[PDB]
């Protein structure tokens, strides 16, 4: 018998799904969430052994410990542990596509556990074993007997043990197998491990028992009262002094409860369940939940006898919210939502998909930190930890079901198969039967990229039909077939059109007024943030709020898929696919978060954070209008902060109290401002910051912020008098300019500056030079590989083109004396196989006090492929420690992505100004910059820069960040003119037409002093 | 507020109508062109394709393929290996509808569609021809003046300009070459506005009160510098208003010794002033040719916003149909993306926005109905590096789109000007 190459086996002998259990026998301990001492870990040093295939396995490892076993801790992937390689793909199947079959050779996880057991447990009562996630499918032994066999590697497999075990030493044997018929449905685009990686427990529940609870809380149109409607089943023996009293408590007060025999309603000629018992409450004025105002109740299900005695006890927390649909919109306690949501896969670059508290925690205050509101469990039911953490913290979630059937051919061939979906039913149905009585779960999905078969409306209705109060969404075969409540499109555009063949992605806009079409459109991936990305971004939320039914999305993601590995010194450096020899597999497509591995912040998060403001500033005349995009919480904790600074020198600042209610507004007058005599460019800067600390914010935490340009005052005087005058050298192969100390060296064969002199120390180590490319960007490169060129990329038509080996002829470079200076003036043309690809034209010209002015005007082929840059690197002597800038900042800012840069004065080490993204490429650019300071030299202008140890070059030919090693001095690109960066997606071009440079026609100008 | 004057004459909009209105819309990859046929009912039973690829103005292949699209259908039309040639200078591809029978609308031959895509484009490498002539520069008190064989330029030392040119004994300006900011207003700039009602909304209101009218250029610098081969004139001056400094012009005048005058401006625009109307220079010529002789978008009149209808080639029309008889005179005549500009003797190359005609911005402001507009001495051309839109979305608020609004703060042009 081959279970695990049987759809229609996904389990033996395991018990019914159900919500949290714990089996208090104190009503008490239940109310407070206390330990119980009915449920135990099994969690800790365990036996393993890896065999190739289960065939492998001998006889004797049921009843005795393997001596060949190596002690492990679990949960555990035993990837993590190297026994075998994780393997990154994120479609392509890791093995052949031959269902339900899988390879011979399956990697065979033998686990064992000797633990010891409780004489009383076994006296009376029912004593089982939950195993909360193992991964891919496992048969059980306990005590050489077997228990039973189970699949789905994401929802708690439970069994009966009762009969197996003894007082005293028991022993565990778990068979996890890699690769299941189940393997089919378990596609999702993520790393492939296995083992048993989530938690193991014993529980102890009495004969008599509560099997099953549902709580529902239904509302009057104005959210005044509420009932809330216990529905409580029992196993073991019916009899008529059996009751069930379900209290309710806002913390220590009861504010209702009910009791009540068991013998439900009649539901039809047979009669009713006489197992069962419903139990309404009335709540007046309930305390409503969200995820800004996460309000909690108690409800404790005691079952005991009419005259007192307990039974047992459960309990969850109770969080008063109703979802509903109506007239195409999301309602949240009849108020629009709007999602400002994350994809959130379990990673964890150390313990692989070993989830813990303390990972959870650290990732929901970062969400809550920067502005998210709402998580997507993509693609399967989380660690039953992770539900508990939203009810609390305040987050919406989408809890979605462990089917992905990617790999397909058609993506729908499994689920359009009647076959399967007794195995989908299973991974649908037991999700909602644990999960249905969070409140932080909102939205049910169906699962992810699997088509759309009929297996998808099958199970669409079974849900509405058990939980009528969630709606359900499920993405596969085009956003909006029938299995969705839902336009839920992944990396829809705001503007463009994508007309695929049966599966279009619309624009969002067009999506939404589409004929006869009326649902709202929340979408499930957009802003694929793959190394340096999310360009585009700010165009999304102006369209979420300027359109009612577009109701947000769910970035795709949040944690980059990384793992450590370890060199020959023991160092550690992040990996993605085909680090571990895995192979077919698909690279760095695995990192896509706004977050590293380790939760440090991607530059990509608070242009998120930004966008995600819950606060919207407007300016006239001295006059602030600040309206809440809040649907319930008044701004409480909420103080303004504005200060004004004229190019980055402070003249006033100030607080202002926010009173602001729920999606209303405040006007706020500034005092009459100090007007300054001073040239330059007056900035307003407003910040939200919140004075009082939080569950999930520090003290003065800012959570909003705003730029507007003021009065802005032009120089009109003229530079001073310098009474020096350059002296001009001209020999065959050099151009020399002197000024006091300072040398400039102009070479007559390239026609570049060459080298520069202050004092007799060099400048320069490679000349000034001419960019007009940049190191690739995962978004320039998409899906193209060396074996496999996809010539639509933006890396691709570049190279081919010949901008990487574009060759700088000369067609001018003479020098001429001015009154008060010497002006150089040199031409370039770039070429590749009789075709010029630019056009350089440039003077120089250095004044009487050491300034050198540099005009530069660039012509560019209009069939030519558009360029990343246009600007000059060159590669500094100086290696300093500080940089000092005028400009958008702090952080790396682009075209496409700088909306949360403010422009300011700014100062960071060196070190700050590389983003150090696991796949090198450009990066650490910023805008808007109209002064640059480092070292001696300094730059005036309005251009983009930046400053790093590393070459494009390097960058470009450079696979992983470890490998890159600090070159001479600090190359230097600035730039004039850049590319947006896009990231849409990350499969085909998405810089927008407005940052690309179609000019054909491009002039900037420095100034390059010493101060 | 029609399409048509009074008497049925088209207004230079109702050709973007009719472009923008087309039953046809075409695709080009490669060589191929992708024609979608908009009708529901009708075949393409009266329609023809004629196709032809242009270097500059000069055409190098022409060709008519027949067509037969369905209702909502596509046709794929594979076109014939087209020539490259050495020659610098942009590939323009131009196709066209054509009925080649007559309707009860429509005379035979008529255009129904027409579409302009850039082909190929091949870039000046080779170098300027040699010049051993060099301009000589004199220097008065209050004068640069810049001389080479009969040619004169005259920058005038106290206010800036090029003050007066000569070829021979001949003046060429009747006013100075002066920057300007601002245009006539038209009906989409003033608005519910009125001398006695004031809407301080409208454009035309806000640039008003700014002082971009009334602005004095107040010169802040002007030296001159001899080269090998040129002669440098560098000007910087600012326009203010009460003390407030609204725009900052800084040139450089390159005359060399092949004639030729190459002219580089600089603005600065003040974030916390209204945007400009224009970006670009304006002089009263002395010459009055009688064709006007341009390369780039026409041949109607054409703003930013307003010429998708507009083809890029070689024009060549009367002076008098470069200005448009709008009864309520404002800014008009403007042809857009011009790289060459031909007028009498003059030429101006590189790469801008003009209007031409016997009316300045000032009398065309000035006067209300066009039967009031006196021909000037002389002809009136305005050169614009930059442009803003036109509007048009309704007539009683600002309408112009932000993507037309000149907003940058910082813009660049460069102007070659010759005799020929
Ligand atoms: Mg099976
Ligand atoms: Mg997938
Ligand atoms: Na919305
Ligand atoms: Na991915
Ligand atoms: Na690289
Ligand atoms: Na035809």
Redesign the interface.
């Given at each position: 018998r081959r279970d695990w190459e049987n759809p229609g086996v996904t389990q033996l002998n395991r018990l019914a799904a159900h919500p949290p259990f714990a089996s208090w026998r104190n009503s008490e301990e239940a109310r407070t969430d206390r330990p119980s001492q009915q449920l135990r870990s099994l969690n800790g040093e365990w036996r393993f052994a890896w065999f190739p295939a289960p065939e492998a396995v001998p006889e004797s490892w049921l009843e005795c410990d393997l001596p060949e076993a190596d002690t492990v801790v679990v949960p555990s992937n035993w990837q993590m542990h190297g026994y075998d390689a994780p393997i990154y793909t994120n479609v392509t199947y890791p093995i052949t596509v031959n269902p339900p079959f899988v390879p011979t050779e399956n990697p065979t996880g033998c686990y064992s556990l000797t633990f010891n057991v409780d004489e009383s447990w076994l006296q009376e009562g029912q004593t089982r074993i939950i195993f909360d996630g193992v991964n891919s499918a496992f048969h059980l032994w306990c005590n050489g007997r077997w228990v039973g066999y189970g699949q789905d590697s994401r929802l708690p497999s439970e069994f009966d043990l009762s009969a197996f075990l003894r007082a005293g030493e028991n022993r565990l044997a778990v068979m996890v197998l890699r690769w299941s018929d189940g393997s089919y449905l378990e596609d999702q685009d993520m790393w492939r491990m296995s083992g048993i990686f989530r938690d193991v427990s014993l529980l102890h529940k009495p004969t008599t028992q509560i099997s099953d609870f549902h709580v529902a809380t239904r509302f009057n149109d104005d959210f005044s009262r509420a009932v809330l409607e216990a529905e409580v089943q029992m196993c073991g023996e019916l009899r008529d002094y059996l009751r069930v009293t379900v209290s309710l408590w806002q913390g220590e007060t009861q504010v209702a409860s009910g009791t009540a025999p068991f013998g439900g309603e009649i539901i039809d000629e047979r009669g009713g369940y006489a197992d069962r018992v419903t139990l309404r409450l009335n709540v007046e004025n309930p305390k409503l939940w969200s995820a800004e105002i996460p309000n909690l109740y108690r409800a404790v299900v005691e079952l005991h006898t009419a005259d007192g005695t307990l039974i047992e006890a459960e309990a969850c927390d109770v969080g008063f919210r109703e979802v509903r649909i109506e007239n195409g919109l999301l309602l949240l306690n009849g108020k629009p939502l709007l999602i400002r949501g994350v994809n959130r896969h379990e990673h964890h670059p150390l313990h692989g998909q070993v989830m813990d508290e303390q990972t959870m925690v650290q990732d929901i205050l970062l969400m809550k930190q920067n502005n998210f509101n709402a998580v997507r469990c993509s693609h399967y039911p989380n660690h039953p930890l992770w539900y508990t953490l939203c009810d609390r913290y305040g987050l919406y979630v989408v809890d979605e079901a462990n089917i992905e059937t990617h790999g397909m051919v058609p993506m729908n061939r499994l689920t359009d198969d009647p076959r399967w979906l007794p195995a989908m039913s299973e991974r649908v149905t037991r999700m909602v039967q644990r999960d249905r009585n969070h409140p932080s779960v909102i939205i049910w999905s169906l699962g992810s990229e699997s088509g759309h078969g009929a297996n998808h409306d099958a199970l669409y209705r079974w849900i509405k039909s058990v939980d009528p109060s969630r709606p359900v969404q499920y993405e596969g075969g085009g956003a909006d077939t029938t299995a969705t409540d839902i336009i839920c499109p992944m990396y829809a555009r705001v503007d463009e059109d994508q007309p695929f063949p049966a599966v279009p992605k619309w624009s969002i806009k067009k999506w939404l007024s589409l004929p006869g079409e009326t649902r709202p459109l929340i979408l499930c991936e957009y802003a694929h943030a793959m190394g340096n990305s999310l360009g585009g971004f700010a165009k999304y939320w102006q369209a979420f709020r300027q359109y009612p039914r577009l109701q947000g999305g769910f970035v795709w993601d949040w944690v980059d898929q990384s793992l450590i590995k370890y060199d020959e010194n023991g160092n550690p450096w992040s990996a993605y696919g085909g680090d571990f020899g895995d192979t077919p597999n698909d690279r760095q497509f695995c990192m896509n978060g706004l977050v590293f591995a380790d939760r440090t912040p991607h530059p990509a998060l608070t242009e998120a954070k930004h966008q995600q403001q819950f606060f919207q500033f407007r300016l006239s005349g001295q006059t602030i209008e600040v309206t809440s995009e809040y649907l319930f919480r008044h701004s409480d904790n909420e103080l303004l902060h504005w200060m004004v600074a004229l190019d980055g020198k402070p003249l006033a600042s100030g607080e202002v109290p926010l009173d602001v209610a729920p999606q209303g507004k405040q006007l706020i007058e500034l005092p009459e401002l100090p007007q300054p005599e001073s040239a330059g460019?007056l900035w307003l800067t407003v910040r939200v910051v919140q004075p009082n600390a939080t569950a999930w914010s520090e003290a003065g935490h800012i959570s909003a912020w705003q730029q507007w340009?003021?009065?802005?005052?032009?120089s009109?005087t003229?530079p001073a008098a310098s009474h020096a005058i350059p002296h001009l050298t001209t020999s065959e192969m050099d151009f020399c300019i002197e000024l006091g100390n300072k040398r400039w060296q102009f070479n007559r064969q390239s026609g570049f500056l060459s080298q520069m002199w202050i004092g007799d120390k060099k400048q320069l180590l490679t000349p000034l030079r001419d960019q007009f490319t940049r190191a690739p960007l995962d978004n320039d490169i998409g899906v193209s590989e060396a074996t496999r060129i996809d010539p639509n990329a933006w890396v691709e038509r570049w190279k081919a083109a010949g901008h990487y080996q574009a060759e700088a002829?000369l067609?001018?470079c003479?020098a001429?004396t001015?009154?008060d200076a010497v002006?150089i003036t040199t031409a370039h043309?770039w070429?590749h196989q009789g075709?010029?690809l630019f056009?350089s034209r440039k003077t120089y010209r250095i004044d009487g006090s050491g300034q050198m002015a540099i005009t530069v005007?660039v012509?560019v082929?209009?069939?030519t492929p558009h360029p990343a840059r246009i600007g000059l690197n060159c590669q500094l002597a100086q290696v300093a420690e500080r940089v000092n800038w005028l400009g958008l900042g702090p952080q790396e800012n682009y075209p496409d992505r700088l909306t949360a840069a403010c422009f300011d004065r700014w100062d960071l080490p060196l070190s700050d100004m590389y983003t150090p993204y696991v796949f090198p490429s450009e990066n650490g650019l910023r805008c808007g910059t109209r002064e640059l300071n480092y070292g001696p030299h300094q730059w005036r202008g309005?251009f983009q820069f930046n400053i790093s140890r590393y070459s494009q070059q390097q960058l470009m030919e450079t696979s992983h960040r470890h490998l890159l090693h600090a070159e001479e001095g600090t190359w230097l690109n600035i730039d004039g003119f850049h590319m947006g960066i896009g990231g849409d997606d990350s499969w085909s071009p998405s810089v927008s037409a407005?940052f690309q440079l179609s000019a054909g026609?491009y002039?900037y100008?420095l100034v390059w002093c010493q101060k």
């Open positions: 460019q340009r003021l009065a802005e005052n032009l009109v003229l002829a067609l001018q003479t001429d001015l009154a002006l043309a070429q075709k010029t056009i005007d012509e082929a209009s069939d309005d407005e026609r002039h100008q």
